[PDB]
């Protein structure tokens, strides 16, 4: 579009509720795939998006696994891994980032996200019962 542009855009409604949000110490994202190049491109995408969203992210590569089996005709499965550990992000930032990167999850790539929520002691445990 060079002249014909939308005049105004209806931004989605984001209401600041009154409840307190969940806090996450850590958010570890283990993506498993059959191709290393796909996982590398996904790593680039996720890391970049985290950078423009302000989230602190570190990347490492868990060791690959192979499942071999025979019918002699010998078939193979390779699983390669990429681990994206995000740190110090709230509930909403984590939620939106995860929605984005899960909707942009490529083919053959499964995801395992572990979220490490932070909580305070129950009031039943601050003092003993008398």
């Amino acid at each position: 579009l060079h002249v014909d542009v939308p005049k105004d855009l209806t931004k989605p409604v984001v209401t600041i509720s009154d409840e307190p949000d969940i806090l996450y110490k850590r958010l570890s994202v283990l993506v498993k795939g059959h191709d290393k190049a796909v996982l590398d491109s996904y790593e680039y995408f996720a890391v970049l998006a985290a950078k423009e969203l302000g989230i602190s992210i570190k990347v490492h590569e868990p060791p690959r696994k192979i499942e071999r089996f025979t019918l002699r005709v010998q078939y193979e499965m390779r699983t390669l891994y990429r681990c994206l550990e995000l740190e110090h992000l709230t509930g909403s930032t984590a939620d939106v980032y995860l929605e984005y990167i899960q909707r942009n999850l490529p083919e053959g790539v499964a995801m395992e996200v572990t979220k490490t929520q932070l909580e305070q002691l129950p009031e039943h445990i601050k003092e003993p019962i008398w």
Binding site: D4, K11, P12, V14, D21
Partner: protein
């Protein structure tokens, strides 16, 4: 002091709508 910020709740399709609002119409293509 740990000031826990407030939850922001958005309707089920907010993220898709924002992403779509980022993208303009394609001039050189027929409709989708």
């Amino acid at each position: 002091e740990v000031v826990i910020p407030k939850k922001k709740t958005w309707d089920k399709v907010a993220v898709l709508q924002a992403l779509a609002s980022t993208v303009n119409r394609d001039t050189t293509a027929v409709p989708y």
